């Protein structure tokens, strides 16, 4: 395959390219991590079942040169970013988790919600 | 990012109240009775959920 | 602020004065008043009519 | 019986009686509230109405469709002669 | 979902058949109901140009036929003022079919089109050759 | 030389190539499961 | 390039207004955000004039024009035609037009060289386009559609033109306008495309709703696409 | 008798009339009224007074342009009327006997009375009414011959139409020109007044300048504004 790019939508920036993407495609699918528990406030009750959907709607990538004045400048446990030029919320951080819509887990993320951002090849035209 | 020493000086005068099953009303957690005169001060007292 | 002249007959129309008349076509008349606007109904000539401006330019008064 | 087809009420109680006013000259019940750092000026005039012609004006209210907009709008002409002063009259306040 | 539109006088109450203008195969449309519309005792809810009326087909191919789906007018035989001062009047009613988003299914419009009716919905005024 | 190189439609929702007339214009392997469905019934 | 933006919550962008290779003209009554998309991105090459025409604010699908001329209907008053010949340049020709089809974007498709006009259009207008805009009067149809102004968007690179129309039709148009011709959707599939979007050599703005696959296929025929600051540092 | 109001009397009006022989009127009575004076320092309203006996007193002094004024006037009169167009009340089916154009309920059994709230028939107009929230557009100087003329006309004319306002006459005198209708016919004295509250909102505070006055006939159908053009239009009649 060719390389891709990730252009911002309403800023038309290059967000991130490839060479990137920590992806970790499948999910868990068991009854514990496939599945979204909510709690109640004690003895561990279990009041919602949600399913999981089916892709995993964020871009988890590495920490890149232009989140480097947001990352350094007041930081934080958790946090969201931008386009540079148009001040969306395009994208956020955390160094927790955040699994996927679909859910494993992750390591720390940066991530970047596959809504209001689009994916690009960065190769030449198709020629429909 | 609420930073938790001041989540729990938020909770003392939201979460930590006690409510009155009659009359809903907002108790504080260590009374009695309830100070509303429309329920007859009662004694049947219960905690607000946490979140 | 655009004064018009009658599509009826000649007269000037002062804004906020008279109807207007769009027909199936898509042409756009004008009218002054109620009378030279009836007698646009009944099909009538205003070649024919005295008292029009297109009548007196016909008949060189 | 209920009324069947609730229905909203056929005219307005505040204005109670319909009863001919007691002269041509209406009353003025109620003058403005008095501010004692302005200068002496009067606060009410007298005039005979006349009759009503139409105008054009050039609408300038923004955020609006019609912005920078003619508009034709009715006017009323109230002839307004000038009036003269013939005397003054001083009221005390009682608690009645 | 409807913009805001300046007061036209109330011509098509339910009941009035109205041409269908687009292309979308009917004939005629069968006012039923206005959307927007107020309530009194023993009033009819009216339509003017620019509103979004209820209507059914009568006339037309039967795929259209007995449904009820949404429409928008955009003609009035009604006069009405317009706010620059001159009272103007179409020759007949019409109006053409659309979803309940705003969107049209007609190709194309013959005749005139108001020019209210442009302005408050903007696929009419794709569509429309003549706007007055 | 006329070019008309267009391989007639590609897709709305997925990326999907080429497509035909008549309507359609959404790769029917979108229009089974995402969209509505608009059955919008109980099943059961 | 390929930019999307929404007027007040309305998706298409043509109808409310009219991007050219000299000017652009915008509706009045819109956001900061709406116009902030075409201030940022123009930036002082272009002037952006807000202005209405015939009192309405759908500029787009009523005027039409290209590099050289702007076309406008009888009804524009005249308050409104003096401040387009201030704010727009010495070099572009103002005139207004006697039409009975009143709306002359639907009407006439056109660009710097080629136009696109409705058939039932009259002889007597067919000299005056080509005296104002210098451009060469073609009567044609697309497919189903005598309207080629809200079906058919164009400009010197290419055209996107309506969905259901047949290659050999394509074909034809092609020939004629000497450019190449692509099918496509705007807007989640609308087929309302000249109306859905505007574009010249520089830019090409369209609504919210259009999907990635169809903004692909939009940049591809207009070849308006071509990145330091991106890396990794950690 | 002037020094007694300057120790007591809070508040002081003052007595005016009209000159009603500058008016086309058949009435020779003139009108009188009393004005309260918002003015400070009650010694220095009676001392304005008393400078001001048998003076005249102009009406741009007190209003101008833009502002917002209310009008107190009584009502056209129409005598006795029934109970359908006195208050808006539904009219009986085709089908009534003894009547269609009334009111079928008055009331109960019981409370055994009519109700005050009920609609009945009597007199209708002629009431004092008042309507607030008036905007002035023109105040006209009465020996001027601009009254009609605007910066955008540029015509020498009055206000008057041609013919005269019907059923009044010459309004070459000062005028007050303001906006939408106020209560009262023709020939009526009418009261304006200052506006009692403050009002921002958006509209007290926007400024007009008119493009044009209709001077019209109002006689019917007048086709032509002032008389001068008349003339230029048909050209020579016999007479």
Redesign the interface.
């Given at each position: 395959s060719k390389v891709t790019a990730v252009r911002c939508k309403k800023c038309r920036t290059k967000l991130a390219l490839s060479t990137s993407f920590i992806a970790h495609d499948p999910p868990s699918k068991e009854s514990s991590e496939g599945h979204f528990i909510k709690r109640a406030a004690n003895s561990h009750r279990i009041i919602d079942i949600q399913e999981s959907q089916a892709n995993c709607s964020h871009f988890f990538i590495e920490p890149l040169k232009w989140m480097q004045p947001e990352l350094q400048g007041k930081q934080e446990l958790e946090g969201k970013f931008s386009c540079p030029g148009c001040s969306s919320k395009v994208g956020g951080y955390n160094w927790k988790g955040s699994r996927c819509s679909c859910g494993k887990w992750v390591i720390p993320a940066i991530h970047l919600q596959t809504s209001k951002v689009d994916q690009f090849p960065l190769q030449s035209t198709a020629l429909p | 990012i609420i930073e938790p020493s001041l989540k729990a000086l938020a909770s003392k005068y939201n979460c930590d109240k006690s409510v009155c099953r009659k009359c809903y009303a907002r108790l504080p957690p260590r009374a009695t009775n309830c100070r509303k005169r429309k329920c007859g001060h009662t004694n049947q007292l219960r905690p607000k959920k946490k979140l | 602020?655009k004064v018009e002249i009658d599509s009826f007959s000649g007269?000037?129309i002062?804004?906020?004065?008279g109807t207007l008349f769009v027909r199936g076509d898509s042409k756009i008349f004008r009218f002054?008043?109620?009378?030279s606007a009836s007698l646009f109904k009944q099909r009538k000539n205003p070649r024919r009519i005295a008292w029009t401006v297109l009548f007196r330019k016909h008949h060189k008064k | 019986s209920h009324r069947k087809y609730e229905a909203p009420?056929?005219?307005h109680?505040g204005?109670?009686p319909?009863?001919?006013?007691a002269?041509?000259?209406?009353?003025?019940?109620?003058?403005?509230?008095?501010?004692?750092?302005?200068?002496?000026?009067?606060?009410?005039?007298?005039?005979?109405?006349?009759?009503?012609?139409?105008?054009?004006?050039?609408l300038?209210?923004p955020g609006s469709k019609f912005h920078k907009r003619?508009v034709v709008?009715?006017?009323?002409?109230?002839?307004?002669?000038?009036?003269?002063?013939?005397?003054?009259?001083?009221?005390?306040?009682t608690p009645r | 979902a409807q913009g805001t539109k300046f007061r036209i006088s109330l011509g098509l109450p339910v009941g009035a058949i109205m041409n269908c203008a687009d292309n979308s195969g009917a004939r005629n449309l069968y006012i039923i109901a206005v959307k927007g519309s107020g309530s009194r005792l023993?009033r009819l809810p009216a339509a003017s140009l620019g509103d979004m009326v209820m209507a059914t087909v009568k006339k037309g191919k039967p795929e259209l036929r007995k449904k009820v789906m949404p429409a928008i007018v955009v003609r009035q035989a009604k006069s009405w003022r317009r706010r620059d001062g001159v009272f103007l009047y179409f020759e007949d009613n019409a109006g053409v079919i659309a979803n309940p988003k705003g969107e049209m299914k007609g190709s194309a419009i013959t005749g005139p089109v108001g020019k209210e009716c442009a302005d408050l919905w903007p696929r009419v005024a794709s569509n429309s050759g003549v706007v007055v | 030389h006329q070019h008309q190189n267009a391989a007639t439609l590609l897709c709305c929702n997925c990326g999907t190539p080429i497509d035909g007339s008549t309507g359609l214009v959404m790769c029917y392997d979108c229009i089974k499961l995402t969209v509505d469905i608009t059955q919008g019934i109980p099943r059961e | 390039m390929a930019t999307r933006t929404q007027f007040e919550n309305s998706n298409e962008i043509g109808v409310f207004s009219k991007l050219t290779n000299t000017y652009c003209l915008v509706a009045v009554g819109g956001s900061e955000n709406f116009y902030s998309a075409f201030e940022a991105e123009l930036g002082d090459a272009i002037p952006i004039v807000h202005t209405t025409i015939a009192g309405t604010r759908i500029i787009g699908r009523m005027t039409a024009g290209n590099r050289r001329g702007l076309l406008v209907p009888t009804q524009t008053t005249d308050q409104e035609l003096q401040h387009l010949r201030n704010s727009l340049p010495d070099s572009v020709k103002i005139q207004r037009v006697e039409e009975r089809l009143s709306a002359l974007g639907n009407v006439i498709c056109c660009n710097d060289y080629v136009a696109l006009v409705h058939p039932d259009i009259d002889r007597e207008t067919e000299e005056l386009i080509s005296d104002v805009l210098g451009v060469e009067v073609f009567r044609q149809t697309i497919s189903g559609n005598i309207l080629v102004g809200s079906y058919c968007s164009l400009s010197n690179q290419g055209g996107l033109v309506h969905p259901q129309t047949s290659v050999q039709d394509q074909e034809e148009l092609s020939s004629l306008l000497q450019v190449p011709l692509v099918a496509g959707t705007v807007n989640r599939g609308s087929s309302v495309v000249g109306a859905g979007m505007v574009v010249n050599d520089y830019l090409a703005v369209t609504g919210l709703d259009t999907t990635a696959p169809e903004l692909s296929v939009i940049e591809s025929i207009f070849r308006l696409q071509d990145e330091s600051i991106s890396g990794n540092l950690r | 008798e002037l020094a007694?109001?300057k120790k007591?009397?809070?508040?002081?009006?003052?007595?005016?009339?009209?000159?009603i022989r500058?008016?086309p009127?058949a009435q020779k009575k003139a009108?009188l009224?009393?004005?309260?004076?918002?003015?400070?320092?009650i010694s220095?309203?009676?001392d304005?007074?008393?400078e001001?006996?048998?003076?005249?007193?102009?009406?741009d002094?007190?209003?101008e342009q833009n502002e917002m004024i209310d009008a107190?006037?009584?009502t056209k009169?129409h005598g006795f009327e029934g109970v359908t167009h006195?208050?808006?009340?539904?009219k009986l089916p085709r089908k009534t006997h003894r009547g269609l154009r009334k009111v079928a309920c008055i009331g109960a059994w019981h409370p055994a009375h009519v109700m005050?709230?009920v609609?009945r028939a009597?007199?209708?107009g002629?009431?004092?009414?008042?309507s607030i929230n008036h905007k002035i557009?023109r105040v006209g100087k009465?020996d001027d011959e601009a009254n009609g003329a605007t910066s955008?006309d540029r015509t020498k004319k009055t206000?008057t139409?041609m013919g005269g306002?019907?059923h009044?006459g010459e309004?070459k005198?000062?005028?007050?020109?303001?906006?939408?209708?106020?209560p009262?016919?023709?020939?009526?004295?009418?009261?304006?007044?200052?506006?009692?509250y403050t009002n921002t909102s958006?509209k007290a505070l926007?400024?007009?300048?008119?493009?044009?006055?209709?001077?019209?006939s109002?006689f019917g159908?007048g086709?032509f504004?002032t008389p001068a053009e008349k003339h230029a239009?048909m050209g020579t009649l016999k007479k």
């Amino acid at each position: 395959s060719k390389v891709t790019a990730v252009r911002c939508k309403k800023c038309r920036t290059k967000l991130a390219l490839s060479t990137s993407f920590i992806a970790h495609d499948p999910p868990s699918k068991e009854s514990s991590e496939g599945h979204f528990i909510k709690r109640a406030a004690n003895s561990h009750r279990i009041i919602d079942i949600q399913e999981s959907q089916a892709n995993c709607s964020h871009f988890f990538i590495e920490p890149l040169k232009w989140m480097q004045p947001e990352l350094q400048g007041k930081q934080e446990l958790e946090g969201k970013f931008s386009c540079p030029g148009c001040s969306s919320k395009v994208g956020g951080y955390n160094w927790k988790g955040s699994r996927c819509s679909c859910g494993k887990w992750v390591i720390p993320a940066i991530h970047l919600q596959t809504s209001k951002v689009d994916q690009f090849p960065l190769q030449s035209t198709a020629l429909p | 990012i609420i930073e938790p020493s001041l989540k729990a000086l938020a909770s003392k005068y939201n979460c930590d109240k006690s409510v009155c099953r009659k009359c809903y009303a907002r108790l504080p957690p260590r009374a009695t009775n309830c100070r509303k005169r429309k329920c007859g001060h009662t004694n049947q007292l219960r905690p607000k959920k946490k979140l | 602020m655009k004064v018009e002249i009658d599509s009826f007959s000649g007269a000037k129309i002062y804004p906020g004065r008279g109807t207007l008349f769009v027909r199936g076509d898509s042409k756009i008349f004008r009218f002054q008043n109620s009378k030279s606007a009836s007698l646009f109904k009944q099909r009538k000539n205003p070649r024919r009519i005295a008292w029009t401006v297109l009548f007196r330019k016909h008949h060189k008064k | 019986s209920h009324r069947k087809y609730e229905a909203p009420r056929h005219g307005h109680l505040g204005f109670l009686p319909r009863k001919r006013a007691a002269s041509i000259r209406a009353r003025v019940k109620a003058f403005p509230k008095d501010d004692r750092s302005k200068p002496v000026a009067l606060t009410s005039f007298l005039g005979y109405k006349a009759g009503m012609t139409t105008i054009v004006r050039d609408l300038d209210r923004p955020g609006s469709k019609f912005h920078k907009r003619e508009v034709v709008e009715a006017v009323t002409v109230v002839d307004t002669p000038p009036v003269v002063v013939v005397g003054v009259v001083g009221y005390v306040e009682t608690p009645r | 979902a409807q913009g805001t539109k300046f007061r036209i006088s109330l011509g098509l109450p339910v009941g009035a058949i109205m041409n269908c203008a687009d292309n979308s195969g009917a004939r005629n449309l069968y006012i039923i109901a206005v959307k927007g519309s107020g309530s009194r005792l023993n009033r009819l809810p009216a339509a003017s140009l620019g509103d979004m009326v209820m209507a059914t087909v009568k006339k037309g191919k039967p795929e259209l036929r007995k449904k009820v789906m949404p429409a928008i007018v955009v003609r009035q035989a009604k006069s009405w003022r317009r706010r620059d001062g001159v009272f103007l009047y179409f020759e007949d009613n019409a109006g053409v079919i659309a979803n309940p988003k705003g969107e049209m299914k007609g190709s194309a419009i013959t005749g005139p089109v108001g020019k209210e009716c442009a302005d408050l919905w903007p696929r009419v005024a794709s569509n429309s050759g003549v706007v007055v | 030389h006329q070019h008309q190189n267009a391989a007639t439609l590609l897709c709305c929702n997925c990326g999907t190539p080429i497509d035909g007339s008549t309507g359609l214009v959404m790769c029917y392997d979108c229009i089974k499961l995402t969209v509505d469905i608009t059955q919008g019934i109980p099943r059961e | 390039m390929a930019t999307r933006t929404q007027f007040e919550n309305s998706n298409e962008i043509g109808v409310f207004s009219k991007l050219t290779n000299t000017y652009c003209l915008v509706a009045v009554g819109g956001s900061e955000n709406f116009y902030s998309a075409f201030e940022a991105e123009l930036g002082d090459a272009i002037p952006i004039v807000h202005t209405t025409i015939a009192g309405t604010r759908i500029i787009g699908r009523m005027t039409a024009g290209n590099r050289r001329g702007l076309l406008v209907p009888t009804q524009t008053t005249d308050q409104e035609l003096q401040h387009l010949r201030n704010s727009l340049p010495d070099s572009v020709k103002i005139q207004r037009v006697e039409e009975r089809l009143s709306a002359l974007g639907n009407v006439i498709c056109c660009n710097d060289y080629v136009a696109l006009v409705h058939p039932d259009i009259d002889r007597e207008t067919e000299e005056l386009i080509s005296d104002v805009l210098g451009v060469e009067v073609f009567r044609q149809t697309i497919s189903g559609n005598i309207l080629v102004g809200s079906y058919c968007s164009l400009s010197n690179q290419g055209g996107l033109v309506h969905p259901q129309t047949s290659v050999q039709d394509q074909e034809e148009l092609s020939s004629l306008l000497q450019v190449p011709l692509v099918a496509g959707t705007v807007n989640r599939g609308s087929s309302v495309v000249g109306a859905g979007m505007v574009v010249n050599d520089y830019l090409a703005v369209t609504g919210l709703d259009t999907t990635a696959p169809e903004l692909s296929v939009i940049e591809s025929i207009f070849r308006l696409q071509d990145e330091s600051i991106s890396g990794n540092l950690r | 008798e002037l020094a007694r109001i300057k120790k007591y009397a809070s508040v002081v009006r003052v007595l005016v009339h009209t000159q009603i022989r500058k008016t086309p009127l058949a009435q020779k009575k003139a009108h009188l009224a009393e004005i309260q004076l918002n003015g400070g320092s009650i010694s220095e309203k009676v001392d304005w007074a008393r400078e001001h006996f048998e003076k005249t007193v102009a009406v741009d002094s007190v209003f101008e342009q833009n502002e917002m004024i209310d009008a107190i006037a009584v009502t056209k009169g129409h005598g006795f009327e029934g109970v359908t167009h006195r208050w808006g009340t539904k009219k009986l089916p085709r089908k009534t006997h003894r009547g269609l154009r009334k009111v079928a309920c008055i009331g109960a059994w019981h409370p055994a009375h009519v109700m005050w709230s009920v609609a009945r028939a009597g007199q209708r107009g002629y009431h004092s009414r008042t309507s607030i929230n008036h905007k002035i557009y023109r105040v006209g100087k009465g020996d001027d011959e601009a009254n009609g003329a605007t910066s955008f006309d540029r015509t020498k004319k009055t206000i008057t139409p041609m013919g005269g306002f019907v059923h009044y006459g010459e309004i070459k005198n000062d005028f007050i020109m303001v906006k939408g209708c106020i209560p009262g016919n023709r020939k009526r004295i009418v009261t304006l007044r200052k506006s009692l509250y403050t009002n921002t909102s958006r509209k007290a505070l926007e400024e007009v300048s008119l493009k044009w006055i209709d001077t019209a006939s109002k006689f019917g159908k007048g086709r032509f504004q002032t008389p001068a053009e008349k003339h230029a239009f048909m050209g020579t009649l016999k007479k």
